[PDB]
Amino acid sequence: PLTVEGYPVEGISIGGQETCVIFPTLSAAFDIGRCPQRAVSQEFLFISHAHLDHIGGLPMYVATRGLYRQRPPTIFIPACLRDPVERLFELHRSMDQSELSHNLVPLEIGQEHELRRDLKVKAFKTYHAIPSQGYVIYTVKQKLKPEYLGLPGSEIKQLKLSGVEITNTLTVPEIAFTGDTMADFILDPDNADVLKAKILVVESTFVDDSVTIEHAREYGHTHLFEILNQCDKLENKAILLIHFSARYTAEEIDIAINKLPPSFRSRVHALKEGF
Amino acid sequence: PLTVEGYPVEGISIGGQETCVIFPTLSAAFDIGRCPQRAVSQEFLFISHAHLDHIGGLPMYVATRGLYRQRPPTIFIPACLRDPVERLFELHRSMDQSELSHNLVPLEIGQEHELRRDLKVKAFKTYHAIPSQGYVIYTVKQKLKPEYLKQLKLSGVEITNTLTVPEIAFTGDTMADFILDPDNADVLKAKILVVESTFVDDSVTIEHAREYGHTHLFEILNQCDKLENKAILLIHFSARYTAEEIDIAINKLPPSFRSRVHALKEGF
Numbered sequence: 001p002l003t004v005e006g007y008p009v010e011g012i013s014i015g016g017q018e019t020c021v022i023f024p025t026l027s028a029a030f031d032i033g034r035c036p037q038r039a040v041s042q043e044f045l046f047i048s049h050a051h052l053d054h055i056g057g058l059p060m061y062v063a064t065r066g067l068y069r070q071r072p073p074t075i076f077i078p079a080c081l082r083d084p085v086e087r088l089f090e091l092h093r094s095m096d097q098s099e100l101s102h103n104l105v106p107l108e109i110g111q112e113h114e115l116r117r118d119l120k121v122k123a124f125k126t127y128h129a130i131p132s133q134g135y136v137i138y139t140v141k142q143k144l145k146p147e148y149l150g151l152p153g154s155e156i157k158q159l160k161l162s163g164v165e166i167t168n169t170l171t172v173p174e175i176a177f178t179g180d181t182m183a184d185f186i187l188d189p190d191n192a193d194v195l196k197a198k199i200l201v202v203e204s205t206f207v208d209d210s211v212t213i214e215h216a217r218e219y220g221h222t223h224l225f226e227i228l229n230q231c232d233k234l235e236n237k238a239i240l241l242i243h244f245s246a247r248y249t250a251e252e253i254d255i256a257i258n259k260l261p262p263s264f265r266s267r268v269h270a271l272k273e274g275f
Numbered sequence: 276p277l278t279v280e281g282y283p284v285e286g287i288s289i290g291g292q293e294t295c296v297i298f299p300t301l302s303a304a305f306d307i308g309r310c311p312q313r314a315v316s317q318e319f320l321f322i323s324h325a326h327l328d329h330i331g332g333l334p335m336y337v338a339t340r341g342l343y344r345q346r347p348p349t350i351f352i353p354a355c356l357r358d359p360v361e362r363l364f365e366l367h368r369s370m371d372q373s374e375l376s377h378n379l380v381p382l383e384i385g386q387e388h389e390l391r392r393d394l395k396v397k398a399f400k401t402y403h404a405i406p407s408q409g410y411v412i413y414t415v416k417q418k419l420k421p422e423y424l425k426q427l428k429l430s431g432v433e434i435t436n437t438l439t440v441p442e443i444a445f446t447g448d449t450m451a452d453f454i455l456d457p458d459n460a461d462v463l464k465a466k467i468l469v470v471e472s473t474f475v476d477d478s479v480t481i482e483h484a485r486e487y488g489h490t491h492l493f494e495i496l497n498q499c500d501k502l503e504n505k506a507i508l509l510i511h512f513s514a515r516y517t518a519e520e521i522d523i524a525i526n527k528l529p530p531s532f533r534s535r536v537h538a539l540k541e542g543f
């Protein structure tokens with residue numbers, strides 16, 4: 001199984017067909033594809049945009065969690081999609097008489113929401129043919145202050161009783177997911193945290209010269225050549241490339257990645273499920 | 276692969292998760308599940324009811340046929356679903372900014388629709404927790420009358436007979452009461468009956484299957500002589516089962532019934 005910077009990664013992203021990228025240790029799915037069964041067990045769903053290959057599985061995801069008596073999921077969407085997504089769920093309810101319980105959380109670009117005491121999300125601007133946004137998940141953890149770092153637990157414990165503040169809150173961009181986008185998201189000055197996230201999940205719909213950059217840009221997509229051109233500004237520990245055109249074989253993908261300069265290439269991974 | 280009375284059968288049916296049963300030589304999908312890629316090449320989609328494990332894949336199926344430049348599919352639904360399904364397409368059209376071209380055919384129970392010169396479908400009543408119907412596909416062929424095996428053709432005598440044969444019956448989700456409905460006689464004569472048996476052994480009672488609008492294998496067994504089908508294809512087993520448990524249950528059936536039973540075990 002695929003693992004990136006310690007995180008298992010599941011799911012699939014074929015450029016024409018479906019995109020659902022799953023981080024099961026975060027209970028997170030980035031887009032819903034055709035509702036792969038592995039996605040059903042994730043409590044948090046982040047929708048980048050309303051193309052059917054990204055959003056089409058949404059009602060089935062909610063319905064299946066309901067059937068299995070799982071906690072209603074929390075679903076993050078661009079704010080402008082709240083209207084149609086409400087309409088969608090009410091239509092299905094009007095037919096199938098089910099509850100389709102969920103928490104729908106519209107986010108505008110730059111807005112944040114808490115997933116858990118130690119986890120939060122922030123939406124960021126992406127550049128695509130229809131309304132869209134990416135998401136950065138941040139860890140929010142307590143870390144020992146420098147002066148207490150090398151200290152026996154017994155000692156730490158008494159400091160706790162006395163009531164000393166012994167930790168600092170550390171907020172770190174952990175996973176950044178673009179969904180479909182042009183490479184210009186990299187140049188948007190609001191996106192600095194995207195470029196420092198431990199893992200960047202970004203589409204590279206086209207990876208070799210069989211397709212031209214400006215053609216990639218024609219449909220709101222990114223060419224691997226553009227990621228390379230900007231690689232010096234990508235401070236991510238890992239880059240997970242997704243959403244390759246269905247025209248490609250897995251071996252073509254590997255070839256394209258292998259051709260990258262070695263220092264950058266060492267940080268590059270590919271989600272090849274289904275290729 | 277799975278072949279039933281000469282028909283390749285593809286797709287998947289897992290109770291509560293996804294149902295899409297594909298007869299590719301008929302360009303037919305019975306329900307759409309989560310839109311398995313194999314379904315996209317079928318030009319005919321027959322929807323039994325609106326539960327999301329049966330209908331959720333619908334917009335993706337239409338969208339993908341458009342991307343491949345295949346003809347807009349003809350989609351059959353219970354007549355009562357016409358307004359909300361029309362609306363659903365309009366809503367996805369707006370969201371994905373795509374045409375989602377299709378031909379929606381509301382079919383009332385008993386109504387028929389010509390699929391090909393030699394093929395037609397008819398809806399039939401099923402008994403489920405929400406409105407539902409099954410479908411029977413008939414062949415319609417012209418064959419020389421036995422006696423003649425030109426001057427009679429010129430004279431304008433009918434020398435052929437039009438033979439209408441029930442070929443595939445698909446129930447979708449239903450209680451076994453579909454067997455009792457006298458309007459469903461042809462269902463019980465179809466060459467292949469594709470019927471759900473959500474539960475297949477005594478770990479669950481018949482009554483429990485019925486509470487949720489489903490059929491227990493035991494009910495089919497207990498009425499097996501009413502079924503004149505050449506083949507019975509069981510589908511929609513509860514996800515609690517393994518393939519081995521399904522095979523065990525079928526193996527217990529009496530030889531006359533057992534010889535005609537097949538199961539769609541994909542994913543089990």
Ligand SMILES: [Zn+2]
Nearest residue numbers: 015051053180
């Ligand atoms: Zn896409």
Ligand SMILES: [Zn+2]
Nearest residue numbers: 049051128180
């Ligand atoms: Zn898109």
Ligand SMILES: [Zn+2]
Nearest residue numbers: 290291328448
């Ligand atoms: Zn079902």
Ligand SMILES: [Zn+2]
Nearest residue numbers: 324326403448
């Ligand atoms: Zn049902």
